[PDB]
A paper describes a structure:
Two crystal structures were obtained by co-crystallization with a non-hydrolyzable ATP analog (ATPγS), for which well-defined electron density was observed for the ADP moiety. To understand how [name]+ inhibits AMPylation, we determined the crystal structure of EfFICWT-ATPγS-[name]+. In this structure, [name]+ is heptacoordinated to the α- and β-phosphates of ATPγS (of which again only the ADP moiety is visible), to the inhibitory glutamate, and to four water molecules. Strikingly, [name]+ is shifted by 3.2 Å from Mg2+ bound to NmFIC and ATP8. In this position, [name]+ conflicts with the binding of Mg2+ to ATP, and it cannot interact with the acidic residue from the [name] motif (E115), which is critical for AMPylation. These observations explain why [name]+ inhibits AMPylation and how it competes with Mg2+. In EfFIC, [name]+ binds to ATP in a manner that hinders binding of Mg2+ to the canonical AMPylation metal-binding site, thereby inhibiting AMPylation.
The most frequent PTM reaction catalyzed by [name] enzymes is the addition of AMP using ATP as a cofactor, coined AMPylation or adenylylation. [name] [name] belongs to class III [name] proteins, which are comprised of a single [name] domain and carry an autoinhibitory glutamate in their C-terminal α-helix. We discover that EfFIC has both AMPylation and [name] activities borne by the same active site. Furthermore, the conserved glutamate implements a [name]+-controlled metal switch that tunes the balance between these activities without conformational change.
Numbering used by the authors:
A (entry chain E), B (entry chain L), C (entry chain D): 5 to 207
D (entry chain A), E (entry chain C), F (entry chain B): 6 to 207
Amino acid sequence: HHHMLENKLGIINQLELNRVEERVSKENAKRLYDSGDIDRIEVGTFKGLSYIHNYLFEDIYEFAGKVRSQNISKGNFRFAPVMYLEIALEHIDKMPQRNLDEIVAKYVEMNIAHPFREGNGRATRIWLDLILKKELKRVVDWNLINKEDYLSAMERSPVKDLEIKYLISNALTDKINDREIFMKGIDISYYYEGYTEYNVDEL
Amino acid sequence: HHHMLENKLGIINQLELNRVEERVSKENAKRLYDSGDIDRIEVGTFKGLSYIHNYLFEDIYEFAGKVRSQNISKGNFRFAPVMYLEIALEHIDKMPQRNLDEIVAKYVEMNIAHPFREGNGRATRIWLDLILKKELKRVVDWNLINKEDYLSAMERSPVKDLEIKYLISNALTDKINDREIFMKGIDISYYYEGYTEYNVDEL
Amino acid sequence: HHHMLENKLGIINQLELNRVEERVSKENAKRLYDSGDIDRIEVGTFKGLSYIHNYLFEDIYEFAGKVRSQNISKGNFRFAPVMYLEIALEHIDKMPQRNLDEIVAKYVEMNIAHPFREGNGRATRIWLDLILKKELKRVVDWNLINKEDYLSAMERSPVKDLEIKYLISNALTDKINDREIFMKGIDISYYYEGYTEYNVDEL
Amino acid sequence: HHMLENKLGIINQLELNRVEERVSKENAKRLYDSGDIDRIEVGTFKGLSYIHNYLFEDIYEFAGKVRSQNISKGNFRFAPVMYLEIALEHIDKMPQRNLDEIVAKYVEMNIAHPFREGNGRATRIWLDLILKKELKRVVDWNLINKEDYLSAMERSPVKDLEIKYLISNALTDKINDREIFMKGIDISYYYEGYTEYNVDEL
Amino acid sequence: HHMLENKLGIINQLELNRVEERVSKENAKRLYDSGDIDRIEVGTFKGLSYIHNYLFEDIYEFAGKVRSQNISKGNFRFAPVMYLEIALEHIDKMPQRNLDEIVAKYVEMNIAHPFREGNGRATRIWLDLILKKELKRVVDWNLINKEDYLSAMERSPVKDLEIKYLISNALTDKINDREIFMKGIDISYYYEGYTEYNVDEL
Amino acid sequence: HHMLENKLGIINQLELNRVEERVSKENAKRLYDSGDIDRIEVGTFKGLSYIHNYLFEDIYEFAGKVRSQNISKGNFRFAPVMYLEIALEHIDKMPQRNLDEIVAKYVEMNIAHPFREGNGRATRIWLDLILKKELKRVVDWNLINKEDYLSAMERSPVKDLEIKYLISNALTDKINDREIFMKGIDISYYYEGYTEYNVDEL
Ligand SMILES: Nc1ncnc2c1ncn2[C@@H]1O[C@H](COP(=O)(O)OP(=O)(O)O)[C@@H](O)[C@H]1O
Ligand SMILES: Nc1ncnc2c1ncn2[C@@H]1O[C@H](COP(=O)(O)OP(=O)(O)O)[C@@H](O)[C@H]1O
Ligand SMILES: Nc1ncnc2c1ncn2[C@@H]1O[C@H](COP(=O)(O)OP(=O)(O)O)[C@@H](O)[C@H]1O
Ligand SMILES: Nc1ncnc2c1ncn2[C@@H]1O[C@H](COP(=O)(O)OP(=O)(O)O)[C@@H](O)[C@H]1O
Ligand SMILES: Nc1ncnc2c1ncn2[C@@H]1O[C@H](COP(=O)(O)OP(=O)(O)O)[C@@H](O)[C@H]1O
Ligand SMILES: Nc1ncnc2c1ncn2[C@@H]1O[C@H](COP(=O)(O)OP(=O)(O)O)[C@@H](O)[C@H]1O
Ligand SMILES: [Ca+2]
Ligand SMILES: [Ca+2]
Ligand SMILES: [Ca+2]
Ligand SMILES: [Ca+2]
Ligand SMILES: [Ca+2]
Ligand SMILES: [Ca+2]
Ligand SMILES: [Ca+2]
Ligand SMILES: [Ca+2]
Ligand SMILES: [Ca+2]
Ligand SMILES: [Ca+2]
Ligand SMILES: [Ca+2]
Ligand SMILES: [Ca+2]
């Protein structure tokens, strides 16, 4: 099934499975940074996002890095249905990214596409930071964006992106090669989704 | 200062604040159970829920156990306006709880009321288990309800409580004095809300 | 439970129960008209609506004529919460009914209140015809309002009442003492709710 | 669209409803008792179209054909005509190996809502055929309460847990039982507001 | 996107709004008085694009061209850019033989919302052309209250009865009356919050 | 008879709009230049009612008075008449010590929407008075684009974050600057579709 570690380690408690998946994927995130692999990823495309997703979740989620084949929703919002996900990703690949407005709009469209069965939030926040670094020489200090504010802004974003754009704009930092900003952002990004067991840099 | 530990322990990292609040409130939950205090609470009333909330969150959330003074929402759903909280809680105190249909309806209305600024989910799930134990001689084995299923069902519940009802009925157990069921349920209930650092029985 | 005939007569097929409830309640509607009792009902108040509802559904619906104690919804519209239902009804009793605009607004508010667990549509349409008869010397020729148009307009009416006002306006007739108009209207009103087995004037 | 309204000069909504119920239920009874139902392609729009035409030929104009107008129920907009064809192309390729996949496929076909009218009844017959082929089960529709079913279908474009739960709990292995089929036709029609006839009495 | 903001260095929103109103209403008056409006393809996106460019080429970047950004009003998300082409080609093939079909076509074109801005005013001109050609009618827009029209358009993706009713009760056979056209331009701009000028005084 | 300036026969919506703008903007200018604005209770429905009456008596029937009908915009239903009074009572007791509390109070007053019309313009004047008293700030409304403001207000019953950001970045310490007040009146009316007059030229 989708959680490849669930049967492998015979785990029947939701919290223990959550902790193990957090540990493995954060190990992978730490390696992605410390190996320098994060600097050799295509920026602003679904190919780069797919690479990030596979890197984080290979041997954790079945078909990591590959588009889902099932329709999904959060709250009352239906993400792009599978039937046109391909064309959605093509359109996102050609969207411009020369200023904060365009980059945030591109991030919002990629969240609407929501191409994977799981792991969209964490992978796409890494992807967004790479776009911001390449184009604005900034990255997000994610700790400066309150979790509940971020989630509300993303819920609002398919209709209007002003909330998420304001939060991102006020969280930007020029410390784009600072390892500490990256690792703290990984921990905050995982906390957004309900993973709080590990610090990435202690793995 | 709603997060009373933030200034007291000078915490500037969201994840660190989340972890300390989890530890303190889970210590309080373990004490609530092991002291037998949980057995001397009024069942199915706002008095009992307020007692549970204060017990869990005193010196963590300002005004623990007391009704909020601000309006709040999650997703697209606006909880009961502050101006009607009093009458909402009065109505809920009068709701019957003789079978699963009525108990689930009462739980759904209490979630709609959402009387506290924070901590509604965890406190109200403890409260619900007490109602089920008293009236049906059952409690919920929360690990049998998947987190995303639970959250979607609660989002659905103000419109129809069928989704939540099924989840609950399929998770009921007669092990109403099983400490392991209670503690595992505390851990799963906190996991529902994004706290995964501690096991309650290890504190 | 709520359908008293299910346990009373041990009917476990939904369609058979539906047919028996249609027969009994249409017998009651026919008696309500032919006895002249309909002419001695208070017009435009919840007292009159409750009298109609009890008359139709006594020994069919538990607590016929009495306000519901649980919250209900249709589609994604939540009708008036129980916690202020009485206040809503007290407001509706004082709403004016001097012309078509005001009568339609009053009908729309009564549908929002939706005071009974079931039977709101049929009872409140009888109630509305009485208001129109008293104040405008008109009643609705319900066959002139298409079922799907009526249902769509009622779904729209809590936001804007133009659709339902238009349909009603176009279907008004001055034959306010014509028995065939009344009986045909009973049949169409039940057809709106999915009852098609009987003609009321054949009972 | 209602071809019988002009033909029999009917001006009462309820009598038109009754005549359409009688004729289409006669067609459903024939579909089962003639054995035609057993040679319908399972799980494709081709099969659904065959069912819809069989039921509603000379009742609905263009029975068996995709609608050309957009439609909605409540505040839910069904698949726009502009990509309906594509929506059907995708549904034909959806897997149907377990209850999860079959329910997801049924939910997508309901979202597509390919016909002007008659989507509910035709697609419930279609769903039973899929369940019969892949799970050796069919739905005992009387075990699914009408209001629960309608609410679950309203919920299903967002989350299909409600409808999945209801279907799962209503499955029976009596996949060639004529009474189960006929009662299911009557309950399926009752869902949509037709209560005049019992199909096996026609 | 607003070319006149940088061109005339305007930093007051109201001042910019007035200048955009004046320039586009001058263009609308010329579109009518030159007879150019009579030589536009009726009922197609090509004609709508011509109207939009004619009104706004000096005001909006890429006037007459489909937008490249996704947009929304209220809680309604208009057709995604990725589908605009297929949506517009579908709209080009929609019939327009009676009021039902014409209103449905207008509703779909509003859902498509092909331009970044100016959809309301341009598409109302386009709609009158269709009504003039096919029904020998145009809309007397002053007979449709602004708030009723806006609510009806908000409702129209779900059900088009409100807007159909308003349009039907506002139709006039004065299809060549210059004052009906000019007053309609003024009312159409008023719908969108431009009230500074009368078009026929420019 | 709600639009007191209206008459019998067909009225032109645009001219009525212009006349109502002129009269109410004259009243707003007088409210400021007479110093009457300085004598208004701050942060209460009493003060809001005074503002609404001052702007709109002889324009709207029952200016300064609570509406008696339920109203909606988009798909949002404002506070029902049935509890409007309790809601205003609650709003009178809400704190206003910082921007978070003041924006929350403004958002609740907009949800209450106590008047039949004129809620936007009157309540924005009211909000500026609260901000002036408690923060020594007012809004430079020209710094908030119309479409951003309207979207943020649509969002505000769910989350006030959008509107709070816009207000926060538009605050100015020029709390007794006549230019800021008059420009803000013009922008506030522009938000609602009135663009004919400049207030200080009346
Ligand atoms: N209601 C919503 N509408 C749109 N986007 C949402 C909604 N809720 C959450 N999101 C986005 O989806 C992300 C979570 O996606 P998910 O697939 O669960 O990723 P992960 O596995 O990393 O948690 C959130 O971080 C947020 O960006
Ligand atoms: N969209 C929603 N609609 C209704 N109820 C919700 C929604 N989202 C979450 N909930 C309920 O609110 C609870 C969380 O409330 P919250 O005040 O955050 O408590 P806690 O501090 O324990 O997390 C969830 O457990 C769920 O039951
Ligand atoms: N989505 C909706 N929103 C508001 N009102 C509705 C909606 N759907 C139906 N209604 C109204 O509710 C009535 C049905 O009420 P119900 O309690 O089912 O009465 P009955 O038992 O007579 O069918 C319909 O006739 C219609 O007037
Ligand atoms: N709001 C909704 N959202 C999604 N699906 C719905 C909604 N309302 C009804 N449905 C589905 O549509 C079906 C009815 O479609 P319809 O075309 O009217 O068929 P029929 O002519 O057989 O009644 C229902 O059985 C239900 O499955
Ligand atoms: N919530 C909504 N849903 C659907 N359509 C809408 C909505 N709000 C406005 N519209 C339509 O959009 C038009 C406005 O489009 P816009 O691109 O702003 O045109 P303009 O620049 O001419 O004002 C309105 O006239 C109305 O027809
Ligand atoms: N959909 C909506 N939801 C919440 N608030 C809204 C919505 N639409 C408009 N508003 C608020 O209502 C105001 C308009 O109120 P209205 O009574 O028309 O006042 P006015 O007569 O001054 O224009 C807007 O300025 C905005 O603040
Ligand atoms: Ca997540
Ligand atoms: Ca740890
Ligand atoms: Ca929570
Ligand atoms: Ca730990
Ligand atoms: Ca009904
Ligand atoms: Ca019969
Ligand atoms: Ca139907
Ligand atoms: Ca019969
Ligand atoms: Ca506009
Ligand atoms: Ca002028
Ligand atoms: Ca307005
Ligand atoms: Ca002027």
